[PDB]
Design a binder for this molecule. Sequence first.
Ligand SMILES: COc1cc(CCNC(=O)c2[nH]c(-c3ccccc3F)nc(=O)c2O)ccc1O
Ligand SMILES: [Mn+2]
Ligand SMILES: [Mn+2]
Length: 179
Amino acid sequence: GSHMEDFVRQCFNPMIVELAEKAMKEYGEDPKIETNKFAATCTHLEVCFMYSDGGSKHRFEIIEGRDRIMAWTVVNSICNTTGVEKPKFLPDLYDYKENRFIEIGVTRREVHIYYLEKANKIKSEKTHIHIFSFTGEEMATKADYTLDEESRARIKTRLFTIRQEMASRSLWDSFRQSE
Ligand SMILES: COc1cc(CCNC(=O)c2[nH]c(-c3ccccc3F)nc(=O)c2O)ccc1O
Ligand SMILES: [Mn+2]
Ligand SMILES: [Mn+2]
């Protein structure tokens, strides 16, 4: 019973919490011990959901928040339909408007450091990368931030609200020095 766990359950939406619990357990991990990663998984989930909520109704296909098999199954259907190459690592969304997959990232370092980390992991110059930070910064591939400034601003605001709430409970320091 950690403070972080009870904060995550109060700060985040119940479906998002349930989805982060499944996702960690599927990879042999307990939201009750690795609670800093519990909070991070919820954060990454919410950001992905607000992101798809930006733009038009049929614009995005949500890959994050499914189980491994069904997620991949949809990645196929997208590839064997649009001709886009099959990514080596599971992405977060697919853009039907731009015809490309999106890897969303949420970092407690510089967006510089962390995009470099992921851009080297995925290597493929097809999958679009978009980064958010808890300080309000953002960095996307080819400076193509995909969404409206207003939609990205809402995400940035929510990320800073989570930081303040974590800090007022003294959990922020441990959360930052954990990534
Ligand atoms: C790292 O171990 C895990 C790995 C997986 C497989 C799929 N992974 C993602 O889809 C993912 N995961 C994270 C993330 C993970 C832990 C802590 C902070 C994070 F931001 N960021 C992303 O951008 C992202 O796209 C499922 C749960 C995990 O616990
Ligand atoms: Mn993902
Ligand atoms: Mn991601």
